[PDB]
Amino acid sequence: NRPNRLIVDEAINEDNSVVSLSQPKMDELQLFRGDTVLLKGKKRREAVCIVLSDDTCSDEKIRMNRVVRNNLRVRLGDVISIQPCPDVKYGKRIHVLPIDDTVEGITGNLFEVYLKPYFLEAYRPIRKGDIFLVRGGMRAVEFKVVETDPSPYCIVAPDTVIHCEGEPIKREDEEESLNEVGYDDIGGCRKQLAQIKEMVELPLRHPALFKAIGVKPPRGILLYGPPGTGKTLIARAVANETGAFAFLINGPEIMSKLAGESESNLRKAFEEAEKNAPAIIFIDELDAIAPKREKTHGEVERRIVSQLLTLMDGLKQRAHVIVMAATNRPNSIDPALRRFGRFDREVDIGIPDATGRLEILQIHTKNMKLADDVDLEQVANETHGHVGADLAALCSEAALQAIRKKMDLIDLEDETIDAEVMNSLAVTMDDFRWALSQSNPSALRETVVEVPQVTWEDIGGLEDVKRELQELVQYPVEHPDKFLKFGMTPSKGVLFYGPPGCGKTLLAKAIANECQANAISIKGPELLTMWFGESEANVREIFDKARQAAPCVLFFDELDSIAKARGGNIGDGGGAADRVINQILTEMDGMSTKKNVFIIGATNRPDIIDPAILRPGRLDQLIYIPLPDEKSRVAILKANLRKSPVAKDVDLEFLAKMTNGFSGADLTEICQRACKLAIRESIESEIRRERERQTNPSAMEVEEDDPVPEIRRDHFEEAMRFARRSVSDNDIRKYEMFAQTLQ
Amino acid sequence: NGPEIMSKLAGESESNLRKAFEEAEKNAPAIIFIDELDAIAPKREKTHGEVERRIVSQLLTLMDGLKQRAHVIVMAATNRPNSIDPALRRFGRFDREVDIGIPDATGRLEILQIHTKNMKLADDVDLEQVANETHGHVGADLAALCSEAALQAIRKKMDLIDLEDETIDAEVMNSLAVTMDDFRWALSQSNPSALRETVVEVPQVTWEDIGGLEDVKRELQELVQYPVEHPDKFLKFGMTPSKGVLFYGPPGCGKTLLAKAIANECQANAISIKGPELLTMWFGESEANVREIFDKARQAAPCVLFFDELDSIAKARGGNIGDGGGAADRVINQILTEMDGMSTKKNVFIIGATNRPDIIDPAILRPGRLDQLIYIPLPDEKSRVAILKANLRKSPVAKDVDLEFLAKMTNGFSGADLTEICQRACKLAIRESIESEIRRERERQTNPSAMEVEEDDPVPEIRRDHFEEAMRFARRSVSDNDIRKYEMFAQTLQ
Structure with a gap:
């Protein structure tokens, strides 16, 4: 609704000093011809200069020299706030000096060769930060701000004095790029970024509004x-977006200095941050200054931790200063800092999922010059355990092997052709695959949090189980009003039991997928690790994380692992009590339903699970997943072969009909054996025909007809010739007895 | 400020601490406050150095030079008592201690009031309901919750106003208010900073929450109520109070629901400890913590210190046969020691509970200890009526359903089973309501009836149907063999 809130669009006058008009808008403005109009955009950097060299284009979109996009803006779709501020003072003059592309060639004076023919009767109505193109030649070189005799911008005049003693730069450009970093650059963490924005932007932009x-x-x-x-x-991106100041503190850099000099820098940091407008202080590697005091032994260490604490306690809320710190883990710093008035809010970054890694590949892949076969999606999905720096390494590896393996006899010779052939350079999928071959991810041990994609299309039946699940997880997160109306206390658990590998792990994920909520899975080996290691304190981390990322279906499978470790039902002299179970019970008893965190369990031998966990306030629910009946195996098969070709001579319904009861993984084994037979047959036929072509000197005999680009019935028939019923009837009867009489 | 003192140089640290007392002595009756004493005088086993002891010594000597003629008093703030050098916890030094604790439902209400003064609330804001559902919070979490709710209101309401710079912002802040949903959302994203600490408060459960047990009530009132009112009778007849009682019976028949009751009738605090803590101190082999509980019980008196699942450690090493050993362990020994080293004249009571009494060490039933055994039986006629009325008092109910009928149909049940029946009925009601609402919403959607008003909840309450469906799947959670075994345990008390 703001009248001067209008889009900016393409520009044709290669001189940046021109700023457009819109006669219908000029009638709104007081835009006069002369020196300057203050056209205001983002990050406070503007493009202020002479005006009215436009009205060639349509209205509602101001024409602004594209070079004032990288500056003052980022991209299209933006908006300008054009408001005149002509008649600026006439100071001495504005700086003259190039930046990047002038040392390349004759330099002379850097003013009187190429730039002099442009400050003619248009004597630089400018604003420091306006960057553009000006030359007396190839017509592509920048003109940047270096000096400032008058603080506000002016209109230059002859007879002045200028010193091109300055040198064109490039490292300064990299620093400018750091300033340039913005929201789009950083990627792979969206939900986390939203919280930081809603936390820091609103207090910053309008201080008095939030202070009222x-x-x-x-x-x-x-x-x-x-x-x-x-x-x-x-x-850095947050600071750039809020247009505020910044200050960086490196822990190792602080610790290197002398004992006496260590505190002076840390005091000066806060002092300088206090002398400016709303600013942000960043500390990297906090563990190097304030680790757990149990490890540290000395005098300087505590004498610096105390200084940090006292400085953090002397803000008073009237300075508009905020601080962010980087640390690997929470249990790695003195708990003194994790107190109220001190660091009191925490945000976790995590590990990018399949979606985020695509964004990281995109931001890195800009000069790659890719080919059609490059499927960035398939690349991203098969990138488990990587982080924001491993992807850059992968890209570099692929690019450099392309460079070498392709120009194995070109790049070795010194000649400009190298750059030229770099234009001819490209990248193929095989390069990415090969690079993925030698990639050692830096994080494959960390607990995973994300939304699994498994849908119930991946498992056919279990209708009543679907309904019960939707009752237990879906309905509560939608209509708490019903619970309030009827005064109801949600149930916080459920227990499974049945034969092995019948899809239990395939159901919990499913509900999470229908709930769009994250999931975490923990198996028996971790339980054995904390048993033998006798470190059950780890059980407090899991729950803590589950609290940060909610909702989550915390799944424990092979719950009977520790029970069976000390024998079966008879076991040892003891009963059914251990340590990790006690910690699980404690954490469950100390959890609030109002965070919507669900807990699921699984086991194959339910008779050897402590009944101390089935009382109210706990699971108190038992669900039995049976052997798949007719046409559930059909859905399982369709899921199995959906990533492999199949002919029509084979009918999955026939395979289901033949079997009279089977487990879940056995059908997968059958499909895998059929695939193995297909692969062996294809390879053998291909090699035999290749040998025929080799021994016979038929220099030209073209024939490309794969005898088996798919699978036939024969493969499945051979598979049927060797198969197992993985579960016996005695187990079925035992489960029937476990059903007891549910009167 | 302790950290402020520690930051300065070694030489400069003592000058400030001397100047503090010097200035305090130059004025009229004054008070000195030391915050975070742990930073200057921690347990000396942790500290290794020269400056640390050279400052603790200065603190002690300064503390010993008051002379009582200056009218100067000092208070210090510390997290826990076992966190400072015991030198300071001596006579002439710090000799009096006061514990702040964790505010209860009543206190949190006052904190909400003192914080909520510019809130500009609406009618629906029920500060009481907010306060009661605030377990584990402290005096700084409530301020954070207030700020969170306020700022969420500011943003979610002025999502297109506050983003534009204009004085109207302040003006719309006048139009700004707060709703209950904001508080509920803030409570959704609130992580309390204290949920692991022992709780001390007066439970509100009354005997209206459990109907029968007349003789049990009389004996309780004899054991806990009467002594705290007429010690003169004990003096006259020269009587020694009994300091314990033991429970035994089937599972979950209200044992936890009785101890609190007596505390409520006595307006005295209560503390509850369960088996998981016993297993934690067994596996961790840290029974010294057993001295903290009692210590706290001494500071907050009277208290009914309740131990349930006493048989947890007994069953951990098997049942009656168990292991080669008998019925002796470590935590039981510490419990016996602390009971034997306690004075009745502080009026602290101890209660126990268990389901399998045959596997509890008889070493604790001798005089000077519980020496009393009480059996809570299965509820008889109309006790379940009271338990039902307690169960559904927070839910609407129609008149077609008669709780007396439900009691009549059953011929013996546990305590939690009736709760399960009520909860299943509530679940059925919720599912039916949701399904009917969504079906009618789909009918309204598919039919382009732009105006068709109908607000008649088919079930804003519960009907019998739900209760007969519940009856169709119910369990007797306890078998008759257990009843006979308890009968044998009754033995012949000639």
């Missing part, structure tokens, strides 16, 4: 996350 209510803003934020996730870029 007077509620407390946050003083410090602590970011978790393994290395390489990208945390410096987040802080």
Whole structure:
């Protein structure tokens, strides 16, 4: 609705000093011809200069020299706030000096060769930060701000004095790129970024607006996350977007200096941050300054931790200063800092999922010059355990092997052709596959949080189980009003039991997928690790994480692992009590339903699970997953072969008909054996025909007809010739007895 | 400020601490506050160095030089008592201690009031309901919750106003208010900073929450109520109070629901400890913590210290046969020691509970200890009526359903089973309501009837149908063999 809130679009006058008009808009403005109009955009950098060299284009979209997009803006679709501010002072003059592309060739004076013919009767109505193109030649070189005799911008005049003693730069350009980093650059963490924005942007932009209510803003934020996730870029991008100041503190850099000099820098940091407008302080590798005091032994260490604490306690809320710190884990710093008034809010970064890795590949892949076969999606999905720095390494590896293996006899010779052939250079899928061959991910041990994609199309039947699940997880998160009306206490668990590998792990994920909620899976080996290692404190981390990421279906399978470890039902002299079970019970008893975190369990031998966990306030529910009946195996098969070709001579319904009861993994084994037979037959036929072509000197005999690009009935018939009923009837009867009489 | 003192140089640290007391002595009756004493005088086993002890010594000597003629008093803040050098916890030094604790439902209400003064609330804001459902919070979490709700209101309401710079912002802040949904959302994303600490407060459960047990009530009132009112009778007849009682019977028949009751009738605090803590101190082999509980029980008196699942450790090493050993362990020994080293004149009571009494060490039933055994039996006629009325008092109910009929149909049941029946009925009601609502919504959607008003909940309450469906799947959670075994345990108390 703001009248001067209008889009900006393409421009044709290669000189940036021109700014457009829109006569219907000029009638709205007081836009006068002369020196300058203040056209305001983002990050406070503007493109202020002479005006009215436009009205060639349509209205509602101001024509602004494209070079004022990289500056003052980012892309199209933006909006300008054009408001005149002509008649600026006439100081001495504005800086003259190039930046990047002038040392390449004759330099002379850098003013009187190429740039002099442009400050003619248009004597630079400018604003420091306006960047453009000006030359007396190839017509592509920048003109940047270096000096400032008058603080505000002016209109130059002859007879002045200029010193091109300055040198064109390039490292300065990299620094400018750091300033340039913005929301689109950082990728792979969307949900996390939204919280930081809603936390820091609103207090910053309008301080008095948030102060009027007077509620407390946050003083410090602590970011978790393994290395390489990208945390410096987040802080720099936030600072760039809020147009505020910044200050960086490196822990190792602080610790290197002398004992006496260590505190001076840390005091100066806060002092400088206090002398400016709303600013943000960043500390990287906090563990190097304030680790757990049990490890540290000395005098300087505590004498610096105390300084950090006292400085953090002297803000007073009237300075509009906020601090963010980077640390690997929460249980890695002195708990003194994790207190109110000190660091009190925490945000975890995590590990990018399949969606985020696609964004990271995109931001990195800009100069790749890819081919059609490059399927970035397939590349991203098969990238388990990588982080924001491993992907860059993978891209570099693929690119450099392309360079070498292709120009194995070109790049070795010195000649400009190298650059030329770089234009001819490209990248193929095989390069990416090969590079993925030698990729050692830096994180394959960390607990995984994400939304599994498994849908019930992946498992056919279990209708009543579907209904019960939707009752237990779906309905509560939609209509709490019904619980309020009838005063109801949600149930917080459910227990499974039945034969082995009948899809239990394939159901929990399913509900999460229908709930769009994350999921976490923990198996028996971890239970054995914390048993033998006798470290059950880890059980507090899992739950803690489950609390941060909610909702989650925390799934425990092979619950009977520890029970069977000390024998079966008879077991040892003891009963059915252990340590990890006690910690599980404690955490369950100390959890609030109002965070919507669900717990699921699984086991094959339910007779050897402690009954101490089936009382109210706990699972208190038992569900039995039976052997698949008719046409459930049909859906299982369709899921199995949906990634492999199949002919029509084979009918999955026939395979289902032949079997009279089977487990879940056995059908997968049958399909895999059929695939193995197909692969062997194809390879053998191909090699035999290749040998025929070799021994026979038929220099030209073209024949490309794969005898088996698919699968036939024969493969499945041979598979049927060797198969198992993996479960005996005695187990079925035992489960029937376990059903008891449910009166 | 402790950290402020520690930051300075070694030489400069003592000058400030001397100047503090010097200035305090130059004025009229004054008070000195030390925050985070742990930063200056921690347990010396942790500290290794020279400056640390050279400052603890200065603190002690300064503390010993008051002379009582200056009218100067000092208070210090510390997280726990076993966190400072015991030198300071001596006579002439710090000798009096006061525990702040964790605010209960009543206190959190006051904190909400003091914080909520510019909130500009609406009618629906029920601060009471907000306060009661605030377990585990402290004096700083409530401020954070207030801020979260306020700012969420600011954003979600002025999502297209506050983003534009204009004085109207302040003006719309006048139009700004807060709704209950904002508080509920804030409570959704609230992580309390204290959910593991022992709780001390007066439970509100009354005997209206459990109907029968007349003789049990009389004996309770004899054991806990009467002594705290007429010690003169004990003096006259020269009587020694009994300091314990033991329970035994089937599972979950209200044992936990009785101890609190007596506390409620006595307006005295209560503390509950369960088997998982016993297993934690067994496996962890840290029974010293057993001295903390009692210590706290001494500070907050009277208290009915309740131990349930006492047979947990007994069953852990098997049942009656168990292991080669008998019925002796470590935590039981510490319990016996602390009971033997306690004075009745502080009025602290101890209660126990268990389901399998045959596997509890008889070493604790001798005089000077519980020495009393009580059996809570299966509820008889109309006790289940009271338990039902307690169960559904937070839910609407129609008149077609008669709780007396439900009691009549059953011929003996546990305590939690009736709760399960009520919960299943509530689940059926919720499912039926949701299904009917969604079906009618789909009818309204598929039919382009732009205006068809009908607000008649088919079930804003519960009907019998739900209860007969519940009856169609119910369990007697306890078998008759257990009843006979308890009968044998009754033995012949000639």
